[PDB]
Design a protein around this ligand. Structure first.
Ligand SMILES: Nc1ncnc2c1ncn2[C@@H]1O[C@H](COP(=O)(O)OP(=O)(O)OP(=O)(O)O)[C@@H](O)[C@H]1O
Ligand SMILES: Nc1ncnc2c1ncn2[C@@H]1O[C@H](COP(=O)(O)OP(=O)(O)OP(=O)(O)O)[C@@H](O)[C@H]1O
Lengths: 185, 208
């Protein structure tokens, strides 16, 4: 639970640091993030913060996050390239019963039907299915609390704005490069 | 070298012919062509020799023939033919990519070193031996790299020598190329690590 509160603090203190403030009280933080005074002080003791030093905490939060994941849907050429490319992909999903129940790149392939039961804490999804499948899958992912999607499909996804989408597409990349070549060469 | 002056006249001829064809006109003379682009009949003869356009004495030029001829010529000139190197998982996904018509871009050929793939067609694109790269590449300006990182640089040196001006690098290799060469580097692993980083830190990962 402490690690679910740490992000709330990190977000606010980032903002605080941005506005110049070198110190923060447990009451300031409580009002800003709606965690009670006492829980904050208890957490900050556990973080070794002895007025609290804003930079101490931000540095602590940042190191913690860096010291301590991902699912993939569509185990075809692109997905396999990803499962073989050289932050662990822990589970993959497909609809091909030939692939369901095998491991590719050491990662087990499950039935898409099991997505809701199997996904718990994972926050990142790689999407390597045909564009036609992408929106319905994305809708299910956002419902299961996935927070970022690597969309390696031609589909332009409809998502809440807080869902981070990294869109990778061959035609989109090529359009841009060709434009440069045709205009700035 | 088709002369610049000739090459610049090609879209002019085409626009003129477009209008003639819409008007129901069946034949066009050298003089009518000359009036259209403001040159003389001898220029038309020379320009048409450079384009390979054919007429019949007296009759002149068939408007339908010439319009489709000039359209086929402009389409080819404006098409982006792309070369792909490395027909593994990633490269075969790309050779199966369906580019829309609106987009005159296609992958025209591919190269590999695997004997089982060389001499085959994948998504309608022929797969050739990398050794023959210099004998297949003529005017193509864009290449896609989907080879292991350790092979990417030697290949890139060859491409830039053959006149490739732009590369999509889907490999981990950080490529060394002259200043004018345009590269987009897409490392799939790094793209994944970037998404994970942002969700932890709400700032964008510094790469390299
Ligand atoms: N609705 C879906 N949910 C999950 N996976 C899917 C869905 N539709 C397709 N896939 C999977 O996405 C992958 C990519 O689909 P695609 O049709 O491009 O196959 P592919 O890469 O050519 O590979 P293969 O030749 O092995 O089918 C395949 O493994 C396919 O089974
Ligand atoms: N120097 C090279 N020039 C051209 N192709 C190469 C070169 N080196 C490796 N390749 C090819 O690049 C492609 C991608 O390499 P990789 O080792 O990732 O194979 P892969 O994606 O696992 O595909 P597959 O399972 O079909 O071998 C392969 O088709 C391989 O045969």
């Amino acid at each position: 639970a402490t690690a679910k509160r740490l992000p709330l603090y990190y977000r606010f203190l980032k903002n605080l640091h941005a506005s110049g403030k070198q110190r923060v009280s447990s009451a300031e933080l409580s009002d800003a993030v709606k965690v009670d005074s006492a829980t904050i002080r208890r957490d900050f003791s556990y973080f070794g913060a002895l007025g609290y030093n804003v930079d101490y905490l931000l540095s602590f939060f940042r190191k913690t996050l860096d010291q301590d994941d991902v699912i993939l849907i569509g185990v075809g050429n692109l997905g396999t390239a990803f499962l073989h490319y050289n932050t662990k992909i822990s589970m993959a999903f497909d609809i091909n019963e030939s692939k369901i129940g095998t491991e590719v790149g050491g990662v087990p392939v499950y039935n898409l039907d099991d997505l809701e039961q199997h996904v718990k804490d994972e926050s990142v999804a790689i999407l390597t299915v045909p564009a036609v499948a992408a929106q319905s899958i994305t809708d299910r992912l956002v419902a299961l609390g996935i927070k970022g999607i690597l969309n390696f499909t031609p589909a332009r996804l409809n998502v809440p704005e807080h869902i981070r989408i990294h869109h990778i597409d061959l035609a989109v990349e090529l359009q841009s490069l060709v434009y440069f070549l045709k205009h700035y060469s």
